[PDB]
Each structure stands twice: as structure tokens, then as C-alpha cells.
Tab-separated table of C-alpha atoms and ligand atoms in Angstrom:
chain	number	residue	atom	x	y	z
A	1	UNK	CA	89.750	104.966	112.289
A	2	UNK	CA	91.119	106.174	109.110
A	3	UNK	CA	89.325	109.756	107.440
A	4	UNK	CA	87.067	108.458	105.241
A	5	UNK	CA	84.553	111.116	103.412
A	6	UNK	CA	81.060	111.407	101.544
A	7	UNK	CA	79.495	114.175	99.208
A	8	UNK	CA	76.137	114.112	99.330
A	9	UNK	CA	73.450	117.406	96.942
A	10	UNK	CA	71.128	119.351	98.786
A	11	UNK	CA	70.498	121.487	96.290
A	12	UNK	CA	69.901	122.501	92.759
A	13	UNK	CA	71.452	125.295	91.015
A	14	UNK	CA	67.187	127.044	90.679
A	15	UNK	CA	66.972	126.320	94.276
A	16	UNK	CA	70.727	127.870	94.885
A	17	UNK	CA	69.444	131.290	93.190
A	18	UNK	CA	66.040	131.838	94.759
A	19	UNK	CA	67.653	130.853	97.993
A	20	UNK	CA	70.363	133.767	97.638
A	21	UNK	CA	68.009	135.962	96.722
A	22	UNK	CA	65.608	134.978	99.808
A	23	UNK	CA	68.672	134.428	101.757
A	24	UNK	CA	66.054	131.581	104.038
A	25	UNK	CA	66.976	128.007	103.818
A	26	UNK	CA	64.760	125.789	105.066
A	27	UNK	CA	67.513	122.874	104.369
A	28	UNK	CA	68.772	119.937	106.987
A	29	UNK	CA	72.443	120.464	107.811
A	30	UNK	CA	74.662	117.537	108.600
A	31	UNK	CA	78.277	117.366	108.195
A	32	UNK	CA	81.816	118.618	108.917
A	33	UNK	CA	82.334	120.502	105.507
A	34	UNK	CA	79.156	122.343	103.563
A	35	UNK	CA	79.802	122.489	99.886
A	36	UNK	CA	78.814	126.386	99.716
A	37	UNK	CA	78.009	128.522	96.368
A	38	UNK	CA	77.586	132.171	94.931
A	39	UNK	CA	75.850	132.843	92.038
A	40	UNK	CA	79.420	133.544	91.068
A	41	UNK	CA	80.964	130.699	92.209
A	42	UNK	CA	81.372	127.145	94.420
A	43	UNK	CA	84.200	126.158	97.077
A	44	UNK	CA	83.831	124.918	100.543
A	45	UNK	CA	83.264	125.779	103.657
A	46	UNK	CA	84.443	124.495	106.797
A	47	UNK	CA	82.942	123.713	110.975
A	48	UNK	CA	85.812	124.427	113.321
A	49	UNK	CA	83.982	124.642	116.580
A	50	UNK	CA	81.976	126.233	116.133
A	51	UNK	CA	82.152	128.825	113.476
A	52	UNK	CA	81.524	127.708	109.548
A	53	UNK	CA	84.290	129.607	107.749
A	54	UNK	CA	85.685	130.012	104.891
A	55	UNK	CA	87.584	131.609	102.550
A	56	UNK	CA	87.101	135.721	101.800
A	57	UNK	CA	87.892	135.572	98.481
A	58	UNK	CA	85.532	132.790	97.226
A	59	UNK	CA	82.673	134.927	100.231
A	60	UNK	CA	83.019	138.361	100.418
A	61	UNK	CA	81.017	140.093	103.111
A	62	UNK	CA	77.754	137.989	102.298
A	63	UNK	CA	75.827	136.374	104.797
A	64	UNK	CA	75.109	133.359	104.437
A	65	UNK	CA	71.153	131.438	103.556
A	66	UNK	CA	69.752	130.180	106.573
A	67	UNK	CA	66.325	128.846	108.605
A	68	UNK	CA	65.323	132.211	109.464
A	69	UNK	CA	67.047	134.492	106.831
A	70	UNK	CA	70.354	135.618	105.983
A	71	UNK	CA	72.977	135.400	108.613
A	72	UNK	CA	75.849	137.837	108.956
A	73	UNK	CA	79.350	137.311	108.760
A	74	UNK	CA	80.322	136.771	112.622
A	75	UNK	CA	84.069	137.799	111.467
A	76	UNK	CA	85.982	138.839	108.323
A	77	UNK	CA	89.787	139.837	108.118
A	78	UNK	CA	90.709	140.663	104.210
A	79	UNK	CA	93.970	139.757	105.555
A	80	UNK	CA	93.873	136.187	106.362
A	81	UNK	CA	91.653	135.280	104.052
A	82	UNK	CA	89.215	134.189	106.091
A	83	UNK	CA	85.369	135.181	106.886
A	84	UNK	CA	83.103	133.292	109.649
A	85	UNK	CA	79.487	132.903	110.407
A	86	UNK	CA	78.370	130.887	113.087
A	87	UNK	CA	78.022	127.440	112.038
A	88	UNK	CA	74.421	125.732	110.590
A	89	UNK	CA	71.945	124.203	113.246
A	90	UNK	CA	72.223	119.792	112.194
A	91	UNK	CA	76.471	120.673	111.470
A	92	UNK	CA	79.047	119.438	113.220
A	93	UNK	CA	82.330	120.563	114.412
A	94	UNK	CA	86.387	119.393	113.226
A	95	UNK	CA	88.748	120.532	116.513
A	96	UNK	CA	91.713	121.723	115.841
A	97	UNK	CA	94.494	120.103	115.818
A	98	UNK	CA	97.486	119.446	118.437
A	99	UNK	CA	99.480	117.157	117.591
A	100	UNK	CA	102.280	118.859	115.385
A	101	UNK	CA	101.533	116.280	112.968
A	102	UNK	CA	103.626	117.120	109.586
A	103	UNK	CA	101.600	114.663	107.473
A	104	UNK	CA	98.142	117.171	106.195
A	105	UNK	CA	95.139	115.054	104.393
A	106	UNK	CA	93.303	117.704	102.714
A	107	UNK	CA	90.017	116.940	101.779
A	108	UNK	CA	88.221	117.884	98.428
A	109	UNK	CA	85.001	118.905	97.630
A	110	UNK	CA	84.236	115.439	95.768
A	111	UNK	CA	85.866	113.808	99.409
A	112	UNK	CA	88.753	112.948	98.225
A	113	UNK	CA	91.254	113.201	100.868
A	114	UNK	CA	94.213	112.969	99.654
A	115	UNK	CA	98.040	112.885	101.212
A	116	UNK	CA	100.417	116.848	101.348
A	117	UNK	CA	103.692	116.941	103.660
A	118	UNK	CA	103.461	120.373	105.373
A	119	UNK	CA	106.405	122.240	104.007
A	120	UNK	CA	106.191	125.991	106.511
A	121	UNK	CA	103.278	127.032	108.244
A	122	UNK	CA	101.189	127.700	105.519
A	123	UNK	CA	101.871	125.474	103.186
A	124	UNK	CA	102.729	121.734	102.642
A	125	UNK	CA	102.643	119.636	99.450
A	126	UNK	CA	100.845	116.762	97.303
A	127	UNK	CA	102.605	113.710	97.328
A	128	UNK	CA	101.070	112.597	94.984
A	129	UNK	CA	99.899	115.640	92.150
A	130	UNK	CA	96.067	116.533	90.477
A	131	UNK	CA	95.484	118.491	88.325
A	132	UNK	CA	95.005	121.672	88.823
A	133	UNK	CA	91.006	121.044	87.842
A	134	UNK	CA	90.995	118.080	90.276
A	135	UNK	CA	91.150	121.157	93.614
A	136	UNK	CA	88.632	123.765	91.585
A	137	UNK	CA	85.979	124.875	94.149
A	138	UNK	CA	87.983	123.079	97.009
A	139	UNK	CA	89.336	126.408	98.421
A	140	UNK	CA	88.038	126.283	102.376
A	141	UNK	CA	88.153	122.385	102.479
A	142	UNK	CA	90.024	121.499	105.939
A	143	UNK	CA	93.687	120.406	106.168
A	144	UNK	CA	93.506	117.079	108.255
A	145	UNK	CA	96.268	116.211	110.707
A	146	UNK	CA	96.112	111.942	111.269
A	147	UNK	CA	93.508	112.511	114.014
A	148	UNK	CA	91.494	114.197	111.549
A	149	UNK	CA	91.481	116.650	113.629
A	150	UNK	CA	91.800	120.558	111.501
A	151	UNK	CA	95.355	122.211	110.726
A	152	UNK	CA	94.415	124.333	108.143
A	153	UNK	CA	91.473	125.912	105.183
A	154	UNK	CA	92.472	125.034	102.435
A	155	UNK	CA	93.440	128.497	100.138
A	156	UNK	CA	95.808	127.931	96.431
A	157	UNK	CA	97.349	125.629	94.594
A	158	UNK	CA	101.209	126.622	93.747
A	159	UNK	CA	100.735	124.748	90.430
A	160	UNK	CA	102.605	124.648	86.778
A	161	UNK	CA	101.986	123.604	82.966
A	162	UNK	CA	97.883	122.892	85.360
A	163	UNK	CA	99.636	120.347	87.298
A	164	UNK	CA	99.483	121.345	91.325
A	165	UNK	CA	102.137	120.227	93.743
A	166	UNK	CA	101.575	121.916	95.917
A	167	UNK	CA	98.831	123.934	98.403
A	168	UNK	CA	98.946	127.068	100.199
A	169	UNK	CA	96.006	126.978	103.535
A	170	UNK	CA	95.553	129.266	105.802
A	171	UNK	CA	97.244	127.226	109.629
A	172	UNK	CA	94.250	127.132	112.361
A	173	UNK	CA	95.767	130.009	114.701
A	174	UNK	CA	95.122	132.582	112.403
A	175	UNK	CA	91.669	131.791	112.829
A	176	UNK	CA	92.389	132.502	116.381
A	177	UNK	CA	93.671	135.918	115.711
A	178	UNK	CA	90.967	136.606	113.744
A	179	UNK	CA	88.832	135.608	116.016
A	180	UNK	CA	90.977	138.093	118.353
A	181	UNK	CA	90.635	140.464	116.283
B	1	UNK	CA	74.251	140.735	97.272
B	2	UNK	CA	73.060	137.578	96.830
B	3	UNK	CA	73.573	134.539	99.932
B	4	UNK	CA	76.199	132.382	100.666
B	5	UNK	CA	74.485	128.933	100.349
B	6	UNK	CA	74.642	125.707	101.263
B	7	UNK	CA	74.212	123.145	97.914
B	8	UNK	CA	75.360	120.101	99.499
B	9	UNK	CA	77.745	118.229	102.244
B	10	UNK	CA	80.944	116.564	102.839
B	11	UNK	CA	80.571	114.537	106.031
B	12	UNK	CA	83.866	113.080	108.100
B	13	UNK	CA	82.400	111.296	111.229
B	14	UNK	CA	80.909	108.818	108.460
B	15	UNK	CA	82.537	105.076	109.700
B	16	UNK	CA	82.358	102.011	107.304
B	17	UNK	CA	79.488	100.965	107.194
B	18	UNK	CA	76.780	97.230	105.154
B	19	UNK	CA	75.268	99.119	102.344
B	20	UNK	CA	71.924	97.642	104.463
B	21	UNK	CA	69.512	95.464	101.345
B	22	UNK	CA	66.736	97.544	100.633
C	1	UNK	CA	81.226	76.798	91.996
C	2	UNK	CA	81.026	80.674	91.336
C	3	UNK	CA	81.547	83.985	94.002
C	4	UNK	CA	78.544	85.452	94.695
C	5	UNK	CA	79.024	88.356	96.285
C	6	UNK	CA	76.193	88.247	99.491
C	7	UNK	CA	77.077	92.389	99.818
C	8	UNK	CA	78.442	95.579	100.369
C	9	UNK	CA	80.359	97.492	102.683
C	10	UNK	CA	80.592	101.726	102.025
C	11	UNK	CA	84.473	102.646	104.002
C	12	UNK	CA	83.221	106.472	104.109
C	13	UNK	CA	79.725	104.996	106.162
C	14	UNK	CA	77.440	106.994	103.395
C	15	UNK	CA	73.974	106.430	104.101
C	16	UNK	CA	72.527	108.668	100.751
D	1	UNK	CA	75.430	103.849	97.801
D	2	UNK	CA	78.352	101.872	95.749
D	3	UNK	CA	81.106	99.610	98.264
D	4	UNK	CA	84.387	99.477	97.296
D	5	UNK	CA	84.331	96.072	99.146
D	6	UNK	CA	81.699	92.936	98.475
D	7	UNK	CA	81.145	90.612	100.656
D	8	UNK	CA	81.346	87.527	98.834
D	9	UNK	CA	81.211	83.695	99.464
D	10	UNK	CA	81.978	80.703	98.182
D	11	UNK	CA	80.059	76.925	98.407
D	12	UNK	CA	82.840	76.569	100.989
D	13	UNK	CA	83.546	79.357	102.657
D	14	UNK	CA	82.620	83.138	102.854
D	15	UNK	CA	85.285	86.412	102.789
D	16	UNK	CA	86.773	89.999	101.335
D	17	UNK	CA	86.376	91.230	97.986
D	18	UNK	CA	88.005	95.204	97.297
D	19	UNK	CA	88.421	97.568	94.085
D	20	UNK	CA	90.992	98.669	93.895
D	21	UNK	CA	91.687	100.802	90.024
D	22	UNK	CA	88.948	98.970	88.196
D	23	UNK	CA	89.439	95.472	89.073
D	24	UNK	CA	87.349	93.767	91.680
D	25	UNK	CA	90.584	92.104	94.163
D	26	UNK	CA	90.466	88.641	96.199
D	27	UNK	CA	92.565	86.130	97.784
D	28	UNK	CA	93.032	82.837	95.875
D	29	UNK	CA	92.945	80.493	98.736
D	30	UNK	CA	88.950	81.988	98.414
D	31	UNK	CA	88.637	82.321	95.092
D	32	UNK	CA	90.965	79.461	93.215
D	33	UNK	CA	90.643	80.102	89.443
D	34	UNK	CA	86.663	80.466	89.951
D	35	UNK	CA	84.598	82.638	87.665
D	36	UNK	CA	82.482	85.766	89.943
D	37	UNK	CA	78.689	86.152	89.470
D	38	UNK	CA	76.931	89.169	87.764
D	39	UNK	CA	73.679	89.392	86.094
D	40	UNK	CA	74.906	88.332	82.563
D	41	UNK	CA	76.244	85.249	83.512
D	42	UNK	CA	79.297	84.102	84.908
D	43	UNK	CA	82.350	86.958	84.401
D	44	UNK	CA	86.504	85.045	84.564
D	45	UNK	CA	89.161	86.278	86.165
D	46	UNK	CA	91.125	89.070	84.230
D	47	UNK	CA	94.181	88.230	87.350
D	48	UNK	CA	94.820	85.339	88.216
D	49	UNK	CA	98.105	85.296	90.796
D	50	UNK	CA	98.175	81.882	92.859
D	51	UNK	CA	101.776	82.924	93.767
D	52	UNK	CA	100.942	86.139	95.798
D	53	UNK	CA	97.346	84.537	96.337
D	54	UNK	CA	95.865	87.076	94.095
D	55	UNK	CA	92.755	87.000	91.738
D	56	UNK	CA	90.706	89.568	90.172
D	57	UNK	CA	88.013	90.045	88.288
D	58	UNK	CA	86.561	93.055	87.432
D	59	UNK	CA	84.802	95.197	88.857
D	60	UNK	CA	81.180	94.183	90.064
D	61	UNK	CA	78.067	96.908	89.811
D	62	UNK	CA	77.539	98.809	92.504
D	63	UNK	CA	80.978	99.183	93.538
D	64	UNK	CA	83.592	101.826	93.940
D	65	UNK	CA	87.035	101.342	93.670
D	66	UNK	CA	89.685	102.740	96.762
D	67	UNK	CA	92.503	104.346	96.214
D	68	UNK	CA	96.133	103.010	96.449
D	69	UNK	CA	98.387	104.480	99.612
D	70	UNK	CA	100.743	107.360	99.049
D	71	UNK	CA	101.679	108.737	101.707
D	72	UNK	CA	103.654	105.363	103.256
D	73	UNK	CA	101.882	105.506	106.692
D	74	UNK	CA	102.843	102.752	108.470
D	75	UNK	CA	99.485	103.521	111.010
D	76	UNK	CA	97.088	101.142	108.704
D	77	UNK	CA	93.626	99.888	109.683
D	78	UNK	CA	91.918	96.564	108.840
D	79	UNK	CA	88.292	96.507	108.218
D	80	UNK	CA	86.506	93.889	108.785
D	81	UNK	CA	83.698	91.882	106.759
D	82	UNK	CA	81.564	93.059	109.881
D	83	UNK	CA	82.924	96.640	108.984
D	84	UNK	CA	84.903	96.064	111.807
D	85	UNK	CA	88.589	98.729	111.850
D	86	UNK	CA	91.102	97.352	113.571
D	87	UNK	CA	93.884	98.954	113.779
D	88	UNK	CA	97.674	98.131	112.758
D	89	UNK	CA	100.996	99.355	113.257
D	90	UNK	CA	102.965	97.895	109.944
D	91	UNK	CA	105.770	95.667	110.772
D	92	UNK	CA	106.947	95.558	107.395
D	93	UNK	CA	106.659	94.595	102.870
D	94	UNK	CA	103.684	92.327	104.294
D	95	UNK	CA	103.300	92.342	107.939
D	96	UNK	CA	101.348	94.209	110.264
D	97	UNK	CA	100.453	94.053	113.536
D	98	UNK	CA	96.843	95.257	115.726
D	99	UNK	CA	97.447	97.845	118.209
D	100	UNK	CA	95.127	94.868	120.573
D	101	UNK	CA	94.755	92.125	119.196
D	102	UNK	CA	91.443	89.703	119.418
D	103	UNK	CA	90.225	86.234	119.140
D	104	UNK	CA	90.490	84.654	115.010
D	105	UNK	CA	86.678	84.685	115.291
D	106	UNK	CA	86.697	88.517	114.282
D	107	UNK	CA	88.992	88.229	111.659
D	108	UNK	CA	87.195	85.796	110.394
D	109	UNK	CA	85.882	85.953	107.203
D	110	UNK	CA	87.618	89.840	106.533
D	111	UNK	CA	90.821	87.850	103.490
D	112	UNK	CA	90.509	90.161	100.447
D	113	UNK	CA	89.285	93.068	102.811
D	114	UNK	CA	91.311	95.877	102.505
D	115	UNK	CA	94.422	97.776	104.456
D	116	UNK	CA	93.676	101.347	104.551
D	117	UNK	CA	95.903	103.972	105.409
D	118	UNK	CA	95.641	107.701	107.850
D	119	UNK	CA	93.429	108.805	104.289
D	120	UNK	CA	91.377	105.755	103.498
D	121	UNK	CA	93.674	104.637	100.811
D	122	UNK	CA	94.640	100.899	100.283
D	123	UNK	CA	98.382	99.890	101.604
D	124	UNK	CA	97.423	96.419	101.487
D	125	UNK	CA	94.973	93.456	100.569
D	126	UNK	CA	94.849	91.012	103.433
D	127	UNK	CA	95.970	88.011	103.441
D	128	UNK	CA	95.528	86.125	106.704
D	129	UNK	CA	95.283	86.699	110.022
D	130	UNK	CA	98.576	85.625	112.168
D	131	UNK	CA	97.990	83.554	115.475
D	132	UNK	CA	99.167	82.540	118.118
D	133	UNK	CA	96.935	79.865	120.808
D	134	UNK	CA	93.467	81.673	118.769
D	135	UNK	CA	94.084	85.878	119.307
D	136	UNK	CA	94.955	87.928	116.687
D	137	UNK	CA	97.498	89.813	116.624
D	138	UNK	CA	99.139	89.943	113.284
D	139	UNK	CA	97.998	89.805	109.876
D	140	UNK	CA	99.332	89.149	106.503
D	141	UNK	CA	98.745	91.719	103.611
D	142	UNK	CA	99.816	91.837	99.903
D	143	UNK	CA	100.630	94.962	99.577
D	144	UNK	CA	98.880	97.502	96.452
D	145	UNK	CA	101.760	97.697	94.316
D	146	UNK	CA	101.425	94.061	94.018
D	147	UNK	CA	98.242	94.369	92.031
D	148	UNK	CA	99.900	97.634	90.196
D	149	UNK	CA	102.048	94.751	89.137
D	150	UNK	CA	99.540	92.286	88.646
D	151	UNK	CA	96.864	94.605	86.435
E	1	BNH	C1	100.007	131.593	96.813
E	1	BNH	C2	100.379	130.268	96.171
E	1	BNH	C3	100.785	129.243	96.188
E	1	BNH	C4	100.544	131.374	94.642
E	1	BNH	O1	99.180	130.080	93.983
E	1	BNH	C5	97.834	130.589	92.776
E	1	BNH	O2	97.694	131.898	93.199
E	1	BNH	N1	97.123	129.884	92.157
E	1	BNH	C6	96.255	130.095	91.923
E	1	BNH	C7	95.666	129.874	93.436
E	1	BNH	O3	94.999	129.077	93.972
E	1	BNH	N2	94.203	130.870	93.810
E	1	BNH	C8	93.118	130.911	94.263
E	1	BNH	C9	93.435	132.598	94.532
E	1	BNH	C10	93.952	133.247	95.985
E	1	BNH	C11	93.748	134.475	96.791
E	1	BNH	C12	94.582	132.999	97.280
E	1	BNH	C13	92.283	130.390	94.678
E	1	BNH	O4	91.377	130.487	92.953
E	1	BNH	N3	92.002	128.812	94.918
E	1	BNH	C14	90.691	128.417	94.949
E	1	BNH	C15	91.523	126.985	94.510
E	1	BNH	C16	91.828	126.831	93.188
E	1	BNH	C17	92.868	126.626	92.968
E	1	BNH	C18	92.609	125.372	92.919
E	1	BNH	C19	89.698	128.534	96.147
E	1	BNH	O5	89.330	129.436	95.898
E	1	BNH	C20	88.359	127.146	94.497
E	1	BNH	O6	87.435	126.294	95.036
E	1	BNH	N4	87.369	129.092	94.409
E	1	BNH	C21	85.805	128.365	93.413
E	1	BNH	C22	86.329	128.035	92.770
E	1	BNH	O7	86.241	127.099	92.181
E	1	BNH	N5	85.164	127.552	92.147
E	1	BNH	C23	84.813	127.305	90.110
E	1	BNH	C24	83.213	127.723	89.888
E	1	BNH	O8	82.152	127.799	90.943
E	1	BNH	O9	82.965	127.762	89.008
E	1	BNH	C25	85.218	125.288	89.905
E	1	BNH	C26	84.421	125.082	91.052
E	1	BNH	C27	84.416	123.180	90.602
E	1	BNH	C28	85.288	122.940	89.880
E	1	BNH	C29	86.252	123.933	88.551
E	1	BNH	C30	85.861	125.365	88.588
E	1	BNH	C31	94.976	129.382	90.905
E	1	BNH	C32	94.397	129.615	90.524
E	1	BNH	C33	93.972	128.576	89.254
E	1	BNH	C34	94.952	128.242	88.344
E	1	BNH	C35	96.099	128.332	89.490
E	1	BNH	C36	96.163	128.937	89.792
E	2	ZN	ZN1	96.888	116.557	115.190
E	3	ZN	ZN1	98.424	106.477	102.102
């Protein structure tokens, strides 16, 4: 089967603000990737092997709102630009890639999967460039190999004149390293 | 600071489906 | 005759 | 929810249609030059290409368009009228081989359906099944480029 994805908004602006302050989210969770927000920005978080990982430049050291109140981060690595919380009950985790493929597929916050060709352990190029605005909000999103396994988490875009042609990502290897750190 | 909040989800585990007539 | 749509398929399996 | 693939029917038979780039495409051998039904009345084809066995009307309601493939992958996936996915290895411009041959019945009524790549993007439109004695082992398809060109 091919990689297909769909998105669902489970909460609005005002419910989000209350939940941020409250720290208690009673909503049911589903999916591998969570659309996430702070009072300042919205991005993505990917559940891999039981841990909900996201980009440190988006989450900082914040707790994640859960049905039992705020949950402290399990891993924080400013250097790796990673933070991880226990995956929410209801989410499904992706498993790391084990095929060394160089044809990755970035899943965006709009649930579009775009092809990128690996050009190093932390970079790949879009086979079809898109406006930087189209990639905004996708930090922390997954880069999948042809089998649907996590190869990395989108971090930054290499763009010019407002068009991104490449993407910088955090390889899963840095996740395992961060866990033992 | 405030907690990070889940405002949506993206599902990859879905397979093609015939939309139910409801 | 005319071609009529008798159903639809959503590739992502989206319930919504 | 909106669909990319419409399960269509004509008096003679039923088959599929796939929306790509705002156009609902299907096979001429199924629709011919027939018009498509709508709440406002029959809407005519925007493109009719008897040669390529390709016809197209503007995308209907409750539909959403599929993105053309740009990764050149040859690990294709055919989707049937029953929403079944069938792995297909691309043999050429308009040819592909099932990784596991199935009875023609299994692929019956799926013409017009999409031939997807690993990213779920449209590679081609299922033209016809190539079967040896009732078992389809391959498929014939119209590449998205033909659609891109035709429009
Ligand atoms: C490493 C090398 C490739 C250098 O490149 C860059 O630093 N590129 C920047 C970059 O990608 N920076 C990273 C951060 C630095 C530390 C690595 C970033 O912002 N990443 C974003 C994704 C951006 C590139 C497309 C990611 O953190 C993210 O999605 N953040 C949330 C966000 O953008 N929220 C917005 C918001 O909440 O308001 C938003 C949401 C949806 C729509 C628009 C805007 C680009 C930012 C946008 C302008 C062009 C430059
Ligand atoms: Zn893999
Ligand atoms: Zn492709």
C-alpha cells in the first residue's frame, strides 16, 4: 500500500488556549502525528516507538496537556533540537526505518506527502519544490521511507526567493542517542 | 509557560475506503 | 444515456 | 469527506473515474462521449481522447483531486472499485505487473481507477487488465503525463 494521510482538527483557538493554561486535555487521541500548538505557534509532533517527539524550537521545555494534567518531557536535547513526551494514550507509533532507502516522503500538516531525495544523513531535496508557506507548520513532522517507517523529523527548509527546494531533518538515529542521553 | 496542546491529528494508518452512503 | 456516480472512494480512508 | 475516485456506472457497465488536476478522468471505452450526471443536469466532457482511451469532465461534487507523481517510482499500487490495493511493478510507460496475479474478476470494474506511487500520487489511469487465461498478471495504463498534456 502507498503512503496516504488525512488530517482532522480536534480543537479550536479558544479551546486550545484554555487547555494550554489548564494543562488538562480530555479529548481522545488517534493517529501517528499530532498537530500541536503553543500560545505562540503551531507545528507537528510524531509518535515513534511509544514517544511523542517534536522539535525543540517549537516546544521548548513545555509540558504537554493530557487528560491527567500537564506531562513533563521525557527527553529534551537542545543540541539535537528534540523533545519527547510519552505518547498520548490513543496514538499509534511509527517504527524507525530499516532499509536504508534514500527516497523519503515528508508528511505535511495538511496531510500531503511530498517526495524528497536523501542527500546526506540530515538532508534531502524536494523532487518538486513548494512555497515555504506550504511547509510552514510542519516542523516535527515525519520523513517516511517507502515502507512508512520514520527516517527523520522535518526541522528546517532550504529555500530561496521564498521557494524551498530542500529540507533539513533530524534522523531517527539522533532520537536513540537522545534517549540514552 | 503554557502546555503544548494537541489541536488536531494526521492519520497515516488509513487505507482506501468507499465513502458510506449516510 | 449518462454517466452517473454511484459511489466514492477516499484514498486515505478518512472517516471524518 | 471528499473522494478522489468516483465509482461510476453507465447502462452497459460500471467502472471508475479519478479526479486529477480538477478533472474527473475515466476510460473512453466505458463512457465514450457520454455526458456526466449532476444536480443541475448533464455536464459534457471537457476532453475526449479516443486514441488514448481518455475522457474527462470537470470534477464533480464531493470529490477532491489527486496529485500527479513526481518521484518516478516504479513501485505502483492499483486501487480497485472495492477499494482493494494491488501492488504493481512498473514494466514500462504504460505497463505494469501485479506482484501477485489475481483473477480478472478481482480487477473487473476498476478501469478508470488510479495507479498510485509510494506517496499516493497519481502515476496513471488504469486502462485495461492483461490476463492469461482468466488471471490478470499485468495492467495497461494511461500515464498522468498524457492527462497533463491533453489538458
Ligand atoms: C539548516 C538550514 C537548512 C537553514 O535553513 C533555515 O534555517 N531555514 C529556516 C527554517 O526552516 N527554520 C526553522 C527553525 C530553525 C531551527 C531550524 C523553522 O522555522 N522551521 C519550521 C518550518 C518552516 C521552514 C518551513 C518549523 O519549526 C515549523 O513549522 N514551525 C511552526 C510554524 O512555522 N508555525 C507558524 C505559526 O504557528 O504561526 C505557521 C503555521 C502554519 C502556517 C504558517 C505559519 C526557514 C524558516 C522560514 C523562512 C525561510 C527560512
Ligand atoms: Zn524503511
Ligand atoms: Zn511519486
